[PDB]
Design a protein around this ligand. Structure first.
Ligand SMILES: O=C(Nc1ccc(F)cc1)C1(c2ccc(-c3nc4ccccc4[nH]3)cc2)COC1
Length: 374
């Protein structure tokens, strides 16, 4: 079994298990804004409301789940504040009453002060009926940006794919134990189980089409997920008033921030972070946007011996076939992600009166393809 210091759940993997819905009474003003963002943004009172807030201390957020919920709340409020209605009217300064606690909370949890995958996917969910299981139909997001933004579809299908891949994560100890104990059959069985889980996760990914519209995603939700690293809209970055004097650059939300998105490439010796190129640079940089325990987990995978070298060293077709089943499943996940970017970003952008993500993902897939053994 995996160590508890890495904070990986048996059921939900890297996702935050049963995350908190309500902050303590001290932070009701935060929850008031975050709960009614679709109304407050559209009616144009979001920015005024945030500007009229008091600066609240973070010290009454005691346990982890409360601190994580606050990050989700504050993060969503920040993106709403920065982008507004999402028509290129941009706030270059985040006010100190929201900025100081958000940055202090961000420092405490070891994350950048900006909405990340961990917030808006891994912590942004609840069961409807606790007695019923984890499916889209028994689930809901805590927070959304606008009405008809498809944040439920986008975030929950991402979360279900995250949870699907969790079935493989618990096999990882078996993979490393088998190698040190030279248990070839156990290793073979283990790799096949990883491939089966990654095959299943692709099927779970298909739900994206059922619950997300292309035009809605591109025009509405994409803008709210955008950050301010290399963005012309905030050239110099955002100002966190009363915390840093100069503006600071931080990247927006990305599937690259998912620990699952990276960990299997690490496990299988696919050197995605090698090359010296933009893609490798990106994947490495996004480990800082993961929770500390998860970026430590990716580190300990890298520190363990190579599964690829072990398979190659044995002159074993079955082990190679099983290894390739995992590689093949990842290739299918990259290809499918590419189909999503085409449908949800490229085509809606052409209908406007994209590419860097395609090229990024094509490199990621190409590195995965070239790691096949047969
Ligand atoms: O962009 C996504 N989500 C997202 C992005 C930003 C954000 F702030 C919040 C959510 C989508 C997505 C893309 C790739 C994966 C994925 N999981 C993998 C596991 C293993 C290997 C390859 C994987 N790709 C999962 C979800 C959901 O529509 C595309």
């Amino acid at each position: 079994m995996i160590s508890k210091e890495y904070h990986i759940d048996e059921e939900v993997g890297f996702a935050l298990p049963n995350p908190q819905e309500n902050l303590p009474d001290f932070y009701n003003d935060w929850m008031f804004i975050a709960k009614h963002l679709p109304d407050l943004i559209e009616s144009g009172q979001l920015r005024e409301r945030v500007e009229k807030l008091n600066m609240l201390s973070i010290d009454h957020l005691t346990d982890h789940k409360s601190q994580r919920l606050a990050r989700l709340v504050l993060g969503c409020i920040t993106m709403a504040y920065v982008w507004g209605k999402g028509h290129g009217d941009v706030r270059k300064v985040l006010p100190r009453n929201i900025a100081v606690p958000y940055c202090q909370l961000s420092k405490k949890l070891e994350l950048p002060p900006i909405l990340v995958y961990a917030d808006c996917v891994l912590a942004n969910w609840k069961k409807k009926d606790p007695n019923k299981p984890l499916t889209y139909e028994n689930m809901d997001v805590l927070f959304s940006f606008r009405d008809g933004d498809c944040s439920k579809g986008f975030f929950l299908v991402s979360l279900l794919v995250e949870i699907a891949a969790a079935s493989a994560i618990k096999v990882i100890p078996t993979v490393f134990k088998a190698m040190q104990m030279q248990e070839r059959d156990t290793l073979l069985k283990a790799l096949l189980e990883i491939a089966s889980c990654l095959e299943k996760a692709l099927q779970v990914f298909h739900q994206i089409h059922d619950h997300v519209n292309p035009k809605a995603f591109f025009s509405v939700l994409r803008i709210y997920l955008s950050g301010w690293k290399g963005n012309p809209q905030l050239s110099d970055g955002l100002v966190y008033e009363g915390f840093w004097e100069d503006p600071k650059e931080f990247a927006g939300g990305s599937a690259g921030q998912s620990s699952v998105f990276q960990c299997f490439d690490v496990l299988l010796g696919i050197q995605q972070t090698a090359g010296g190129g933009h893609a490798a640079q990106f994947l490495q940089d996004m480990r800082r946007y993961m929770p500390p325990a998860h970026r430590n987990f990716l580190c300990s995978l890298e520190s363990n011996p190579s599964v690829r070298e072990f398979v190659l060293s044995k002159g074993d077709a079955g082990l190679r076939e099983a290894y390739d089943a995992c590689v093949k499943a990842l290739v299918s996940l990259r290809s499918y992600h590419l189909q999503i970017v085409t449908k949800y970003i490229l085509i809606p952008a052409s209908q406007q009166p994209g590419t860097d993500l395609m090229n990024f993902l094509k490199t990621v897939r190409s590195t995965t393809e070239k790691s096949l053994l047969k």
